[PDB]
Design a protein around this ligand. Sequence first.
Ligand SMILES: CCCCCCCC
Length: 205
Amino acid sequence: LAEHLLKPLPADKQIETGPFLEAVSHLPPFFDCLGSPVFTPIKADISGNITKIKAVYDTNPAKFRTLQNILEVEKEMYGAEWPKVGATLALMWLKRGLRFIQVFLQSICDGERDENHPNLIRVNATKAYEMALKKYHGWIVQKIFQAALYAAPYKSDFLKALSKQNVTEEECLEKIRLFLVNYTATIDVIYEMYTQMNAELNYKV
Ligand SMILES: CCCCCCCC
């Protein structure tokens, strides 16, 4: 996990597309080791969005050098259908996926738990869901999240799984905190970009 840290933000806060996609491409495979096929569709959504942005990038790497480039070029390229189109739309959903991972991990690292059920991660996943995803989900997808939530492993097993290995829980969390530095900064920059370009949409699914 700290074998594939995201690069720090450069001074101009512009995120290079290629290295960003390479970096986040290492996240989806962590879903295979949560212990349930319930996560298979979840992995597909994130992967699918990464693939969709990569494919737009591959048509003109120079034109789409940065993520900013993607949003502004597609704004010009598409007119009225933007921002509900192309790599812009893919990245709008990707960022929420990544933000969910961010809030989930930070909650774990911050020692947030249910005093009553302390070896579960339901409260952490629930907060992540509320902050990142829930307001863009209709009632049906929300009830599906609630069902999917029980496929969550214990905190102990999830952390041991991320050590895929000879290492204490405290060591593992410190590596995760390290990862979260440039991850969070990068995700924040992307959310800021959607706000400044007025590319953020609020429709539910
Ligand atoms: C460099 C990005 C490659 C696309 C990977 C798709 C999702 C894992």
